[PDB]
Amino acid sequence: GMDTSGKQAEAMALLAEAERKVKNSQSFFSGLFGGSSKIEEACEIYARAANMFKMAKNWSAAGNAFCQAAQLHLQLQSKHDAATCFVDAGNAFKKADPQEAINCLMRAIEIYTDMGRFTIAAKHHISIAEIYETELVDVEKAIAHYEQSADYYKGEESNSSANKCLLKVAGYAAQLEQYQKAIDIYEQVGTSAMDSPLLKYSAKDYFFKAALCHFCIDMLNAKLAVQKYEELFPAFSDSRECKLMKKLLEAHEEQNVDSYTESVKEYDSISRLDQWLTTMLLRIKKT
Amino acid sequence: GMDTSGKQAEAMALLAEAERKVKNSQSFFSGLFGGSSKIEEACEIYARAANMFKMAKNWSAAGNAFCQAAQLHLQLQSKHDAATCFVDAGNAFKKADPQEAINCLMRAIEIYTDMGRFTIAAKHHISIAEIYETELVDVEKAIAHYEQSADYYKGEESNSSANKCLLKVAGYAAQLEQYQKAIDIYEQVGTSAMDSPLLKYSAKDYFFKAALCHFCIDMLNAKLAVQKYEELFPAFSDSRECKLMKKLLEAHEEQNVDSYTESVKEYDSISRLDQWLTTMLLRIKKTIQ
Amino acid sequence: GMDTSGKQAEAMALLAEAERKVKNSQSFFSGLFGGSSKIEEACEIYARAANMFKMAKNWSAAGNAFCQAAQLHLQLQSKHDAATCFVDAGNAFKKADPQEAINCLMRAIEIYTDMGRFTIAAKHHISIAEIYETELVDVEKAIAHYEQSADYYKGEESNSSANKCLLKVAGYAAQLEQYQKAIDIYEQVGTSAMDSPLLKYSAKDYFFKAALCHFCIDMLNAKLAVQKYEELFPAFSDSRECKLMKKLLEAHEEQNVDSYTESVKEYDSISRLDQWLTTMLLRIKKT
Amino acid sequence: GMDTSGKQAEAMALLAEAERKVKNSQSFFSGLFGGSSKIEEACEIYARAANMFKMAKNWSAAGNAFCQAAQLHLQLQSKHDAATCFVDAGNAFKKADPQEAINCLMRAIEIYTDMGRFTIAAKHHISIAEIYETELVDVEKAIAHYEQSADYYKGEESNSSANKCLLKVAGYAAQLEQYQKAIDIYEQVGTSAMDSPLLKYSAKDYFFKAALCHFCIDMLNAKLAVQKYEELFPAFSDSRECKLMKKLLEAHEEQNVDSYTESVKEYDSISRLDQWLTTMLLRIKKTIQ
Amino acid sequence: RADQLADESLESTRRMLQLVEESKDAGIRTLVMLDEQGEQLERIEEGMDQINKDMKEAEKNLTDLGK
Amino acid sequence: RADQLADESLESTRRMLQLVEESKDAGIRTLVMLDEQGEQLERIEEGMDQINKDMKEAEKNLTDLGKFAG
Amino acid sequence: ALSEIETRHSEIIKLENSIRELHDMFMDMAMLVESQGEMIDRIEYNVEHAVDYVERAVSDTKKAVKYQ
Amino acid sequence: MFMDMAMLVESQGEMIDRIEYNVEHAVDYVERAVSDTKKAVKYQS
């Protein structure tokens, strides 16, 4: 361990001799102006000093050295190397302090978008969305990043990633009580899944979620929505989802807690429910 | 959004700069004779502006700029890059103008298959068939494209893709065209799978569809093919499809619509239909007299 | 139709231009010493002519053109392009006449093993084995090719490919009344499948086949082998295989041929057998 | 075999040529200048020789040739080729004599950690651990090697291979090492799994194993552990593992060999036990007193 | 004790229903990930072809220029 | 009426046994095969990283040599 | 009736055995396929990086040759 | 479900084999060409 702290110390000494290299840039490079490769190897020693720091378990120092190498490397040349170094710094900063990881990831996003790499930009946007969700409490930023990544992916016919991003956003919205967006996304994804035989069987869950988010907002439209899903998908009523939903909405017509309480307990008797569905039912059935 | 408008504005600026660049390049060629760096730089500007423009939410003009850059590059005895740019422009036009995408994809197919690559040509043919059938309501040229893709795939001994394409072609033919081609293809695929390491238990469906087509042709042909399948494939003898089809045939022989109705209804109840068996069954019922 | 005819006409024109090119290029090399660019251009012309011949659905002449291009290129002191041309010639010759396809694939194997690469050599060996099996009846050559490929796979630590080749070799050997080699291979693979978290489910089948093939020799040896296998794998008795083997053993012991046939018929009814296993069981019933 | 005989003859011819080439190298290092290219050609012939030895089935000769080529190449201010050659020598020595393979793989690990590629370093670490465990009768070094592999995987954010490595190391350390670490790692993996939908349905096995570890240590602590697990994991209450453990601990507290024996027999009747679980059960039974 | 057997059969039926339903639920998402893997796989294949062609043409042009 | 009870019982057991054995036999082969693809993709990774390092070093050496010549 | 019920009991025990075996088999399905998906994702990322780097490498090498 | 998955996975593997062949050819060609060109351009001086 501390044999790796000793080489971390001599890596700090290597950063000190890189400081000597920038002093050379200050004074001696006037006669060594052709030593652009000298600056390149200075950046290389910066990068491997950051590597030794990372091996030394100094995440803050590793990220700082990575970002410094990236800054010293973007001399209007080898922009891709600078972007790679910036993303490495962001990965190093993911643990410990991720705040500057966010900014360096935005810098990499900008570099890639200017270059034209959309898949990498969308993946990094999803990465920052998830770091926000897991580290911060803001979801709106994560929602926006997921939507933006989905837009990139759909721009290049990468439909599945956009579909999953929209699914997550719709689930959060339903938990965040924005039911129009939730219902629209759920019905769109259900219809899209119905298109191909591979995802043909999955439409039941999407129809169920769309029907639930319909039924919360406007109770009367719940009947019309479940009916519409049934003729649109003739094998939706057969599904336990549609039968259960019809039972709940028909019981709710008469004020009898016992009916739908028994219905939900029976439904939980066959399969455990999730936090989203349970919270949704408890909120909605109160009124 | 400010970003979109700025992207559209700078893309227009870059396109104008590229046009002026190509004009100045054709001028300098006689003026100074610098070589070909000017033309390649103009192509680079066109490509960058086109990619930024398609990032700018606008598609048609992005594909047009990509096509112009690809044409100028092919003017410099460069083909694979020009062909790939043609393919990208066609993909962009997919959502803007189908015909331009179709033409660019034909050009890409021709150049690629001239180079010596057949797999990319077959994939492009499949893409053409899909884009045509998904939005344009027609099959015949889609059938031709599927057949060409299957032929290209078989040329390099890629049996699975060619078999899938032939199965789709036969299904479409049975749905619309005559059943002889469909019968032959279904029987071929079914008989080429008795030894399938992982498909030992679905040749029954192929032979059943072939028998259904035979029944759609004539009762006598129906029964003769039914036996042919029975002795050819022993496992099919014990299949529920065999009992169902034999019951349907013996019912249709005696001219009793009730037995046919009950048989089809029970088959649908136990197991769902497929939208192709139901249509053939209805056409058969239409000729019960 | 028209496309094939036009391709063939253009290809004939290209071939004639190619003979003119080679003749005039050798003449110009002799009289002017212009280098080797003309020879490379002629080789590329041959390659394009072969490609257009394959387009024209003329595989024999396409393979001839590929072989000519390979010979010309290797005459130019370069290998990889020559090997690719030879393997393309073999692929063209795969249908119609595969004997020269076999010869050119053997040449490709020879050059590949001269270079030092293993995976491609084993793949070509198994490909030649498949060609012999599908188009010829000399299964011994297929066995030899399978043995070479299995040796290469095992040496290169590719346990899966070696296992597959060994299983095929054992099946072919037991097919041709050879049991000792089959017994050894089947028991080896079964033992290899002992600890596998996944292949453990399949380990029983190899042992079952090994027990059957060993019982092709005598009875007492079969009983000892099966009880030894059960002791090695304690749960093997759970499957119907052990009870079926014991029942067949006792039925043969007491000359209860009708009981043996009834049990085999019951097993066939519950699960159909294949030609090979049915042949083995009938051979067992012969005594 | 004629093939192997000729292969061996050509192998000896190449050995003689390589001896001549190393003679040339030592003559050009002390007699001439610019022998770096000559010794590079010597490396090329040495590598060809080593590869064809490996082809000749002479694994020891192939490994020796690869090691010689690698050690000679280390002097050429190059490291990646040296690491690859050392890895090839280790692969050649894997069978027959693997002792020097461990040292060469450690040298490759040193080179890689010098470069910065750590996933390859972790892969080589797990290879070293598995070869040592399978061929050397010693586990503590295997435990340490798996520990370093898990550290490298987790530090690289590869949490899945790290989770499997922790599972294996803790499970084996339970057999011969104090079970408290088994408790810690098993509970950690269960906690990580329950939230994740992937392993949430199998973490009950980890909790059962950790509780059995507690039981083989002590009963009261085993109780407290199992109630804490079920409180944190309500679904574990209905798990058959929970019922089996409740029966086992009750029988142990009442000190009745018959009841515990019949309960374990009942559990054995359905499904199947394992060597480790059977050993743990026997060890706790021996201390019933 | 046939009624006890009937009750046990009902319980086993419920257990089978639960297990089969869980298997189906996991199979659906198995489908989804296989689709995703194939999607990524096609793109990597196309990129490999593009790089290979660019590399062949580039190296050949450089070698021709070297002469 | 027990005759039809037995008929449905025998149909149930027959279809159960055949279909269950079908699934059990089918999954085995596919999942024995998946490891082959896994190891092939491992080889892809190894060769590809070597390829990338090779071009990186070659290009940087070429740039350095070109700068030296000038 | 006795034979029928005994056969049905045998069939139900076989039901549980087969279903549990298939269930464990399926969780293995999922684990293996997820691992493969991750590792192909990494390989695709590296493929894209290598493609871009080698493209710019050829570009700059050809520009340098033109400079000569 | 599983029958559907069979052919898909089989096709994935069948194309994977072509990919590995292509990359192997590419790497061998790259190594040979780069080595020969570097030696030729470094030893002529």
Swiss-Prot record, chain F:
Any Gene Ontology biological process: axonogenesis
UniProt keyword annotations, A-Z: Cell membrane, Coiled coil, Cytoplasm, Lipoprotein, Membrane, Palmitate, Phosphoprotein, Repeat, Synapse, Synaptosome
Molecular function GO labels: calcium-dependent protein binding; lipid binding; myosin binding; protein domain specific binding; SNAP receptor activity; SNARE binding; syntaxin-1 binding; transmembrane transporter binding
Signal peptide start-end: none
Domain named t-SNARE coiled-coil homology: residues: 3-65
Principal subcellular localization: cytoplasm
Post-translational modification: Palmitoylated.
Region (Interaction with CENPF): 1-59
Entry GO CC: actin cytoskeleton; axon; axonal growth cone; BLOC-1 complex; cell cortex; cytoplasm; cytoskeleton; endosome
Lipidation sites (S-palmitoyl cysteine): 69
Compartments in which it is found: Cytoplasm, Perinuclear region; Cell membrane; Synapse, Synaptosome; Photoreceptor inner segment
Physiological role: t-SNARE involved in the molecular regulation of neurotransmitter release. May play an important role in the synaptic function of specific neuronal systems. Associates with proteins involved in vesicle docking and membrane fusion. Regulates plasma membrane recycling through its interaction with CENPF. Modulates the gating characteristics of the delayed rectifier voltage-dependent potassium channel KCNB1 in pancreatic beta cells.
Known partners and oligomeric status: Part of the SNARE core complex containing SNAP25, VAMP2 and STX1A;this complex constitutes the basic catalytic machinery of the complex neurotransmitter release apparatus. Recruited to the SNARE complex following binding of the SNARE complex component STX1A to STXBP1. This complex binds CPLX1. Found in a complex containing SYT1, SV2B and syntaxin-1. Found in a ternary complex with STX1A and VAMP8. Interacts with HSC70 and with SYT9, forming a complex with DNAJC5. The interaction with SYT9 is inhibited in presence of calcium. Isoform 1 and isoform 2 interact with BLOC1S6. Interacts with CENPF.
Similarity comment text for this entry: Belongs to the SNAP-25 family.
Protein name: Synaptosomal-associated protein 25
Swiss-Prot record, chain G:
Family: Belongs to the syntaxin family.
Entry function: Plays an essential role in hormone and neurotransmitter calcium-dependent exocytosis and endocytosis. Part of the SNARE (Soluble NSF Attachment Receptor) complex composed of SNAP25, STX1A and VAMP2 which mediates the fusion of synaptic vesicles with the presynaptic plasma membrane. STX1A and SNAP25 are localized on the plasma membrane while VAMP2 resides in synaptic vesicles. The pairing of the three SNAREs from the N-terminal SNARE motifs to the C-terminal anchors leads to the formation of the SNARE complex, which brings membranes into close proximity and results in final fusion.
Keyword Membrane: yes
Gene assigned in the entry: Stx1a
Record domain t-SNARE coiled-coil homology: where: 2-64
GO biological process: calcium-ion regulated exocytosis; exocytosis; hormone secretion; insulin secretion; intracellular protein transport; modulation of excitatory postsynaptic potential; neurotransmitter transport; positive regulation of calcium ion-dependent exocytosis
Cross-linked residues, Glycyl lysine isopeptide (Lys-Gly) (interchain with G-Cter in SUMO): 62-63, 66
Chief location category: membrane
Entry keywords, A to Z: Cell membrane, Coiled coil, Cytoplasmic vesicle, Exocytosis, Isopeptide bond, Membrane, Neurotransmitter transport, Phosphoprotein, Synapse, Synaptosome, Transmembrane, Transmembrane helix, Transport, Ubl conjugation
Post-translational modifications reported in the UniProt record: Phosphorylated by CK2.
Span covered, complete protein: 191 to 258 of 288
GO CC, any one term: presynaptic active zone membrane
Site ((Microbial infection) Cleavage): 63-64
Tagged with keyword Plastid: no
Superkingdom, natural source: Eukaryota
Subcellular location, record wording: Cytoplasmic vesicle, Secretory vesicle, Synaptic vesicle membrane; Cell membrane; Synapse, Synaptosome
Complexes and interactors: Part of the SNARE core complex containing SNAP25, VAMP2 and STX1A; this complex constitutes the basic catalytic machinery of the complex neurotransmitter release apparatus. The SNARE complex interacts with CPLX1. Interacts with STXBP1. The interaction with STXBP1 promotes assembly of the SNARE complex. Interacts (via C-terminus) with KCNB1 (via C-terminus); the interaction increases in a calcium-dependent manner and induces a pore-independent enhancement of exocytosis in neuroendocrine cells, chromaffin cells, pancreatic beta cells and from the soma of dorsal root ganglia (DRG) neurons.
Signal peptide (UniProt feature, chain positions): none
Gene Ontology MF annotations: ATP-dependent protein binding; calcium channel inhibitor activity; calcium-dependent protein binding; chloride channel inhibitor activity; identical protein binding; kinase binding; myosin binding; myosin head/neck binding
Organism: Rattus norvegicus
Protein's UniProt name: Syntaxin-1A
